[PDB]
Amino acid sequence: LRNRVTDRYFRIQEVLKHARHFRGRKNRCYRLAVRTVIRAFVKCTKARYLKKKNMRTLWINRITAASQEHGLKYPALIGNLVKCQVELNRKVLADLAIYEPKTFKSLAALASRRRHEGFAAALGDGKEPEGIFSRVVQYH
Amino acid sequence: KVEGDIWALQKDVEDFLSPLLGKTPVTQVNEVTGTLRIKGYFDQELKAWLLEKGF
Amino acid sequence: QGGGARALDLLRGLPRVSLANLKPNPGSKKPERRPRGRRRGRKCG
Amino acid sequence: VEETRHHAEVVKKVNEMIVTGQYGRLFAVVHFASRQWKVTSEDLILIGNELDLACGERIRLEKVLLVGADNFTLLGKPLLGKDLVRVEATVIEKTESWPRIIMRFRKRKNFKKKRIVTTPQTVLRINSIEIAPCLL
Amino acid sequence: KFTRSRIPEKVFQASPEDHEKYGGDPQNPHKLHIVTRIKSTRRRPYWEKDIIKMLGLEKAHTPQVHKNIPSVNAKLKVVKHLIRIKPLKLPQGLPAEENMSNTCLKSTGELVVQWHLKPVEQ
Amino acid sequence: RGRIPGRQWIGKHRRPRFVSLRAKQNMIRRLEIEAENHYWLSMPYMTREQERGHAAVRRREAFEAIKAAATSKFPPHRFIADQLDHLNVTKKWS
Amino acid sequence: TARGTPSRFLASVLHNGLGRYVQQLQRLSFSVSRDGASSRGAREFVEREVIDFARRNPGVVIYVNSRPCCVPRVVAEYLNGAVREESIHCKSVEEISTLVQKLADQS
Ligand SMILES: [K+]
Ligand SMILES: [Mg+2]
Ligand SMILES: [Mg+2]
Ligand SMILES: [Mg+2]
Ligand SMILES: [Mg+2]
């Protein structure tokens, strides 16, 4: 019995279909396209880490841009919102800085007020009571 | 050459070799072939035991 | 007694045994290994 | 001492805006599926896991971190009380993700393997976001 | 040649100024440890890697409870530069049978037996 | 200009490496954590004599479970129902 | 792949669930074979499972056409007009039951 490949056409079309949008001979020649489709798939897997990294970097720039309009720096906003137990991530703050400018200014005022409270507490030796917004809600 | 409900034979063998070993025996039950395979050598002990039941 | 009878009455409700529905005893025929694919192809052991 | 009573005046004014309904659309920030969503009413959100809920069922999102309006905003520390804000969503579509390519390749090592995964997904629609006058 | 290290016994001799700095009491030493690996076993000798496995410190930043006994302390003194050691404190005491489902180990080293997830009314 | 002979970080003439300000702070932070570890290892609860024999029973029982699992390795039972269930491949409607 | 495939924004059909929830699945067409092992899982699904499945979803019309065929298939038609055709060739009862329920949830 002699066996020959009869469905070799279907084995090469499943790889060439991913290369139809390429440029040059690497969209129709199986030998050339297979080495490009594999690299395209490899870049697809490794770009999932970059997309998460790039989104956060984009959010930081947008948060920084809006903070400067209110005379604040990015470390001064994120750092002082943590001490108020306001757990808002960069995704929300970037959205708030774009679609809710009035709400973002309220957060900037809260962060600025909390920032000023820490400086006042740093000047004292603990005799004066803590700031109004410096109180922390305890959970048991 | 075990016929009938072989799983009843396993329980009797387990309750019989346990005092000699101090622990439950490790047995393989092959219903298709009707054979019981027991880890360890119990040739002389089981041959006398099966003669008691009249097999 | 019960074991012998249970192996025959259960076979009645099953479809007809033919040359199609037969298979070897599991574990009695190891799959053949061929020098094909990534696992066994680069240098074929 | 002077600022403590000044806060009560502001809170009472904002609380007085809730009984009379002097607010329009409300946007709420909720924590769901380890993610914070800036959602409003009648919008869609895609969740990358199965909730084991039949489609059409109406549920409540318990965790709300921020509720805001045109003139007033309330902040949770870190969460708002269940007696102050209520966000309800509806399961409308449960489907699998589009095929994702997971391929790894190392040069000169004959290392190449391709995996395709379809993570389950769930779509929720926020129906209503209502608050209650419980600030005081 | 690079080999193991014999740490002098004087190193593990707390001074009176240390008891007023870390809050420990030599008269009443703590019963249990809270060991947490904070460093990679990579680029470290094989004997340090084995001790990490023996102590159940495979996954990093995963607290583990061990007994404050010389044999266990002997293993800790070998990988003392890869882990963080904190005493286990029991403000409510040892968990009972009814408090097994309500335990929670806080970052301060205290194990509470009533995890209510509710703001303090005080 | 500015060529470093050979490779950068190996050889006789290597590219100089300098310690930054945060690099010093990171090392100091590591030292403080380990300096506290030396304190908690200086207060054993029990001595060597007291500790001896306090876990012999548990250790002995733990290994007996390993021996039981190691000595219980045996082929699984073969049922007659499973062999007959392969005939269902030809089940059809009348 | 993303660049090699089309994409769309998240949306629904006529704002489903805004006022009421409407099951977007509209029709199911099963093509089972009286004879053939390929439909063994499908035939068992028709005998005991599709009857109870039709009880739960009254808004979906199910057609069971028994004709000779080598690959049994399930065709799902939706309100928006898209038609999804799936093959249940040699699948267990549980795998078919889960697959059909998935088609019901999709829009
Ligand atoms: K290999
Ligand atoms: Mg990150
Ligand atoms: Mg090879
Ligand atoms: Mg080759
Ligand atoms: Mg060079």
Swiss-Prot record, chain B:
Gene Ontology biological-process entries: mitochondrial translation
Protein location: Mitochondrion
MF term (GO), any: structural constituent of ribosome
Tissues with expression: Ubiquitous.
Keyword tags: Mitochondrion, Ribonucleoprotein, Ribosomal protein
Main localization, broad class: mitochondrion
Gene Ontology cellular component terms for the protein in this record: mitochondrial inner membrane; mitochondrial large ribosomal subunit; mitochondrial ribosome; mitochondrion
Assembly and oligomerization: Component of the mitochondrial large ribosomal subunit (mt-LSU). Mature mammalian 55S mitochondrial ribosomes consist of a small (28S) and a large (39S) subunit. The 28S small subunit contains a 12S ribosomal RNA (12S mt-rRNA) and 30 different proteins. The 39S large subunit contains a 16S rRNA (16S mt-rRNA), a copy of mitochondrial valine transfer RNA (mt-tRNA(Val)), which plays an integral structural role, and 52 different proteins. Interacts with OXA1L.
Sequence similarity: Belongs to the mitochondrion-specific ribosomal protein mL49 family.
Name of this protein: Large ribosomal subunit protein mL49
Classification of source organism: Eukaryota, Metazoa, Chordata, Craniata, Vertebrata
Gene: MRPL49
UniProtKB/Swiss-Prot annotation, chain C:
Tree of life domain: Eukaryota
Annotated compartments: Mitochondrion
Transit peptide: 1-16
Chain spans, region Disordered: 17-45
Compositional bias segments (type: Basic residues): 31-45
Residues annotated as transmembrane: none
Assembly and binders: Component of the mitochondrial large ribosomal subunit (mt-LSU). Mature mammalian 55S mitochondrial ribosomes consist of a small (28S) and a large (39S) subunit. The 28S small subunit contains a 12S ribosomal RNA (12S mt-rRNA) and 30 different proteins. The 39S large subunit contains a 16S rRNA (16S mt-rRNA), a copy of mitochondrial valine transfer RNA (mt-tRNA(Val)), which plays an integral structural role, and 52 different proteins.
Family (UniProt): Belongs to the universal ribosomal protein uL15 family.
The protein's name in its UniProt record: Large ribosomal subunit protein uL15m
Organism the protein comes from: Homo sapiens
Full-length numbering of the shown residues: 6 to 50 of 296
Curated annotation (Swiss-Prot), chain D:
Cellular component terms (Gene Ontology): mitochondrial inner membrane; mitochondrial large ribosomal subunit; mitochondrion
Annotated GO MF terms: RNA binding; structural constituent of ribosome
Keywords recorded for this protein, A-Z: Mitochondrion, Ribonucleoprotein, Ribosomal protein, Transit peptide
Protein name according to UniProt: Large ribosomal subunit protein bL21m
Portion of the parent chain present: 70 to 205 of 205
Example GO biological process: mitochondrial translation
Family recorded in the similarity comment: Belongs to the bacterial ribosomal protein bL21 family.
Cellular compartments annotated: Mitochondrion
Quaternary structure and interacting proteins, as annotated: Component of the mitochondrial large ribosomal subunit (mt-LSU). Mature mammalian 55S mitochondrial ribosomes consist of a small (28S) and a large (39S) subunit. The 28S small subunit contains a 12S ribosomal RNA (12S mt-rRNA) and 30 different proteins. The 39S large subunit contains a 16S rRNA (16S mt-rRNA), a copy of mitochondrial valine transfer RNA (mt-tRNA(Val)), which plays an integral structural role, and 52 different proteins.
Main location (coarse class): mitochondrion
Domain of life: Eukaryota
Covalent S-S links between cysteines: none
UniProtKB/Swiss-Prot annotation, chain G:
Cellular location(s): Mitochondrion
Tissue note: High relative levels in skeletal muscle and testis. Lower levels of expression in the heart, brain, placenta, lung, liver, kidney, pancreas, spleen, thymus, prostate, ovary, small intestine, colon and leukocytes. Expression is coregulated with TWNK.
Transmembrane residue ranges: none
Coiled coil: none
Cystine pairs: none
Family note: Belongs to the mitochondrion-specific ribosomal protein mL43 family.
Summary of subunit composition and partner proteins: Component of the mitochondrial large ribosomal subunit (mt-LSU). Mature mammalian 55S mitochondrial ribosomes consist of a small (28S) and a large (39S) subunit. The 28S small subunit contains a 12S ribosomal RNA (12S mt-rRNA) and 30 different proteins. The 39S large subunit contains a 16S rRNA (16S mt-rRNA), a copy of mitochondrial valine transfer RNA (mt-tRNA(Val)), which plays an integral structural role, and 52 different proteins.
Name of this protein: Large ribosomal subunit protein mL43
Complete-protein stretch covered: 2 to 108 of 215
